[PDB]
């Protein structure tokens, strides 16, 4: 599963397309590199499970992370740019409908938003 | 130069015999040869191919007799006559394809190192600094500076937090020429094992002084790996610059503040210092904190075996014939040579505490052109 | 290794296929996992050695375990099942004489053996 | 890797070929070895680096040397006869401007600048 | 020199031949080896010359040794057999008379006499 690359189209669809590459793997848990002159991109994937209480819900978190970092130049120092999101429900849940929520959520985050969400506008 | 070898040894022989008018009429002999046969490059340092077939059997012979009129004929201890032939081979297996690639693929080292610090831009210039700021206290006194609280003792230990870092980017240095030499670094995969079984039946294992049936069955096992060694590109390296100076300038910081006040502090090696961190300011701009590397040939090796044990059938056999139980193995290895498209790979040189020893050093709180 | 999927049926050769997914592996331990609307399959295989005595023989220990858990519904709570065969045998003995123990076991039970056996008898 | 075998023109250009042969090779250095009825051929090299000077610049040194044993005769004890030259530069300069050098000195040097020598002219 | 390959010819004319090649040189010493099965070869070639003193002739001396030693087989245990020749002349001293000399001993020596020596007489 995720195969040995992972591809990733910045700019939304018909962008220009990088692929990194598989470098690490324990618990669950992989991430992706590739190295560039100028810059860097770095994508991992994480899994978690709450311990068990006496008398509460179980719930499941997933993360998924993209980050990029560019490299100092004259006097400016490196900076870093990265966004991830988690999605969160109980162990026994029904998958299509959180994947209908999942949907929605992508669906609502687009270019015109993310323009006005940098802005402050709250 | 490419080299074809042949060698052979003895595994069993024994002796058949049949008797009529009390005379051996027949007394023929039977030989199993062990056989093995391997070729090799040698006279060229680099990497050769090569591959060796090889065999072996393993034979528990037969016994018995039996008597007629003036007649017999045994075959006690007499290996069995199929080995004779003796030929035998693997089982086919599912066929590999483009492990070179993959391999190559896995295996880049390549990885983000720890980003390069504000000051590394003015690390050329920290021999100035110290000289003059030296000079002008001991010029007007100590009393320089006070509006700063700076002084004697916060300027020598920032010379020796340079000393150290000096010293630990030239053991790193030291450390990545040693890497350079005995082929770069090596690293290895494992692609997979395949295992398989099957049966045969009907194998007749003699066909003289009677006839003998057994069973057959066969075992096949394959590995398959590949190395590679990553070696950095040629001039791509640090400075390599030895240094017995700083065990000098220590020897001298140990003198303390009043050593110092008198003539010790014209003794400092300030041009050695203004070469190496000049050439190291340089160098860690030029590059990000890494060495680029390049791979050398990727190859891979796939050794395959098979086991043929057999079982004597007795219901096709005459009576007096006892035992003939025997196993033969199979062993092949091959070295096969591979080389894929240009890459090239970065590894970080110094991380954290390497970098963070001279990150607040005491001395830049004072206003540039009083020094400049 | 065997691969990234395991296939199990239910109810021996007669159907139901399920198909597990690889999602983890640590140092010849190897789990599989597939969730389900009310059900979820998990499977775990494992290899080890005991602990080094100074005058007797090492073992070795082969370890496949099946489990599955039901979802809570109504007023019944959580509960799971599983299945699992263990082997021993020393280092280095001959592995096909170990390979007809085991399976000649595995020929024994049949699903009339289950229906006596989990009626208590012995 | 000069050759198994040097040769050795004495008197310059003129003739008098003698030819020596390798004997010992270690460390970065080299010497051959020639006998005769009256007299013994031998020549050296040699690589090094000096001790550095805590405020120094490394250099390497390179020379060879020449030497000529005369047995003993009647009552005159035996002797020899020697001539080498050494070069001098710092760890990664410019080899076309030291090599440069160097020729200098073997023009300079001729059977009339050696007769001013052997008078102690200076 | 000696050659690359150095060949020894056991029996003398007209027997066994095994052959050897260079493995290591320093200090004027050079020997070689060869594997088999139930035992093995070693050749060595050594010079050396005597110290300098006040008052009395110097001397130099030239070594060549032949050794195999047999793997040790049940009870039987690990033994060697060896012999060398030892040349020893002053610095300045003719060649010929030295090489004649030695070529006496060389046609001294043969098999029947050395049979006679294992035969303790003297
Ligand atoms: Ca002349
Ligand atoms: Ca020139």
């Given at each position: 599963a995720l195969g040995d690359t992972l591809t990733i189209t910045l700019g939304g669809s018909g962008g220009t397309a990088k692929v990194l590459r598989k470098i690490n793997q324990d618990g669950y848990t992989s991430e992706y590199y590739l190295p560039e002159t100028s810059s860097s991109f770095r994508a991992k994937v994480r899994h978690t499970k709450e311990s068990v209480k006496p008398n509460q819900v179980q719930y499941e978190r997933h993360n998924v992370e993209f980050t990029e970092t560019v490299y100092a130049s004259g006097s400016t120092p490196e900076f870093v740019r990265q966004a991830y999101v988690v999605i969160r429900h109980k162990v026994?849940?029904?998958?299509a409908t959180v994947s209908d929520l999942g949907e929605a959520l992508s669906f609502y985050l687009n270019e015109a938003l993310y323009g006005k969400l940098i802005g402050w506008e709250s | 130069m490419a080299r074809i070898r042949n060698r052979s040894s003895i595994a069993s022989s024994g002796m058949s015999t049949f008797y009529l008018f009390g005379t051996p009429i027949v007394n023929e002999e039977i030989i199993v040869r062990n056989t093995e046969w391997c070729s090799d490059v040698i006279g060229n340092p680099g990497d050769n191919p090569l591959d060796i077939h090889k065999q072996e059997w393993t034979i528990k012979p037969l016994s018995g007799q039996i008597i007629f009129g003036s007649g017999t004929y045994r075959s006690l201890q007499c290996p069995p006559?199929?080995?004779?032939?003796?030929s035998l081979s693997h089982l086919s297996l599912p066929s590999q394809s483009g492990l070179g690639t993959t391999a190559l693929a896995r295996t880049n080292p390549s990885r983000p190192a720890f980003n390069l610090p504000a000051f590394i831009g003015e690390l050329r210039d920290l021999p100035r600094m110290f000289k003059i700021a030296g000079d002008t206290m001991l010029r007007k006194g100590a009393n320089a500076f006070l509006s700063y609280q700076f002084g004697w003792k916060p300027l020598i230990s920032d010379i020796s937090k340079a000393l150290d870092f000096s010293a630990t980017v030239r053991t790193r240095s030291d450390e990545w020429h040693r890497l350079?030499?005995?082929?770069?670094l090596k690293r290895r995969i494992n692609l997979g094992v395949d295992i398989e079984q099957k049966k045969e039946n009907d194998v007749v294992l003699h066909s003289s002084n009677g006839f003998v049936v057994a069973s057959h069955t066969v075992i096949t096992v394959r590995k398959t790996w590949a190395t590679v060694r990553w070696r950095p590109d040629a001039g791509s390296l640090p400075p390599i610059t030895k240094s017995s100076s700083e065990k000098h300038a220590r020897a001298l910081l140990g003198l303390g503040v009043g050593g110092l006040i008198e003539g010790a502090w014209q003794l400092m090696p300030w041009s050695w210092m203004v070469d190496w961190f000049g050439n190291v300011g340089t160098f860690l701009q030029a590059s990000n904190n890494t060495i680029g590397a390049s791979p050398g040939l990727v190859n891979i090796m796939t050794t395959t075996t098979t086991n043929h044990q057999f079982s004597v059938k007795?219901?096709?056999?005459?009576?007096?014939i006892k035992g003939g139980d025997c196993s033969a193995t199979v062993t092949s290895k091959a070295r096969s040579q591979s080389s894929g498209p240009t890459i090239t790979a970065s590894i970080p040189n110094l991380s954290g505490r390497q970098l963070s020893i001279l990150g607040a050093l005491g001395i830049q709180r004072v206003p540039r052109h009083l020094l400049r």
């Open positions: 026994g849940d029904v998958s | 006559e199929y080995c004779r032939g003796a350079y030499s005995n082929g770069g007795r219901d096709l056999s005459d009576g007096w």
